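Hi team,

Filling in the usual template for the complex we talked about on Friday. All components are listed, including any nucleic acid strands or ligand strings, so the model treats them as one assembly.

SUBMITTER: L.P.
PURPOSE: interface mapping
COMPONENTS: two
RESIDUES: 516
SEQUENCES:
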Amino acid sequence: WKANLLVPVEDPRELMGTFDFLRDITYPKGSVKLLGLADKENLLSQLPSISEGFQEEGVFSSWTIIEENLVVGMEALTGSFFRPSILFLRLPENRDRDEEIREIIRKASMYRMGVLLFSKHPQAGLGRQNLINLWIENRWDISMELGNMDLALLIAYKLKSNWKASLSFMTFAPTAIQAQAAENFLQSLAELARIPNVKMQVLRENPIKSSKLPFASLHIFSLDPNPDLDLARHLMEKAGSSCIFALDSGEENALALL
Amino acid sequence: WKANLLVPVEDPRELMGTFDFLRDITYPKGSVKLLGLADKENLLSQLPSISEGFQEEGVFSSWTIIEENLVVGMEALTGSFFRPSILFLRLPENRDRDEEIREIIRKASMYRMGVLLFSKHPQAGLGRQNLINLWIENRWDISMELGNMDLALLIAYKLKSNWKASLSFMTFAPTAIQAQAAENFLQSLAELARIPNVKMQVLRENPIKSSKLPFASLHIFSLDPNPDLDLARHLMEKAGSSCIFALDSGEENALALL
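RESULT (copied from the run log):
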């Protein structure tokens, strides 16, 4: 599997702060397209250098300069070489952009694109990068049709591998019968995907409802096609660590890759 | 050389966000003492785990729980095994604590302690950790008595080595005669300290006065015994990347180590 990211950049300093993480998602032979948006930040000077940096660190890369611009950005991707694309967005602390962000997210599916929405904890950042939780939504038999969790799983596996971190699958269930089915589903997923040393937790309570989350450097969730961005922010704050939210294009088949 | 840090911790999430950097300063066989200050953050649960984490990652570590407390913290260090100590402080964005911070810095020298003051850029963080600038104050013959720059140099060398980053020595001079002397001093320092592949820049203007700084992942400066914390903040903002400020205990002899 190779992640090909479209990364809008307004501020090159934010990009520099995210470089290693973008690299960890895409290494090896994945790709990163830097889409520079407008030039007080002198993107013209910085983007080419950062793009060359990705190449030096084993990831393919390109850059261009200049919400309507994101649509054009994705539209331009259509027949490009670097295969299925994924839109990488940062979830800001300020809510001033939630509507555009939501609109961008809604639009990305139209262009056969997955979306990664990254909510980096302002104090912890990615911490020790040694523990990853993949949160699997209450469903429990395994069809290749995993529904909206293929990108989440692929990212979990990729970061497990690039960070050499421990990975846990987390879910929740209302009843004993459902809890058992969820346990069995998680064990089957790990077994099919051939991911070793995965720990499973089936929780009594939903992560949105609980007071605390089981600790991780990074929590991976699925992103609802019609997301509550405040819910996303709340999860990160409650976790006390970084969260990433993954919306499928609908074209990924994680198991067939893994 | 082995850095033995005293690290006050009020918020374990900030500690998690700084863990790798503290490790990069102290690895290998350096040490980190976590001094937990007061318990809504449940330091009692988190500090022991983080301390064990340092040990796992090849750095010695200990922890205790509970401005007056920092003085006691350092006072307690007196005859402890882990040799010369260095106080590690974060420079917050909010100025509410500058006076206490300044007082702490002033006090640290009394206990034969160096001080590292870290100003992490809120967007760039440590970026790609591939370029380090060591800023050497306008002086130019080499005496073992480098004055207030021994800790700065040792940290530059340590991070160069642990990040496998490129290192540059930066300085400034008012006249051609002084510029030549500074060039020669920097070449001599690199040669004596046996640090290879160091690039030297002698600038026309002071870093405080210039509009922009030559780019680095991390700028290392000396910290004035009586520091202007706003000047420190300004340097980081102008740089667009992280800065660390190092005040000597006065007992370090960097060259004799390097």
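MY TAKE: The first strand of chain B starts at residue 4 and ends at 9. The first helix of chain B runs from residue 12 to 26.

Thanks, L.
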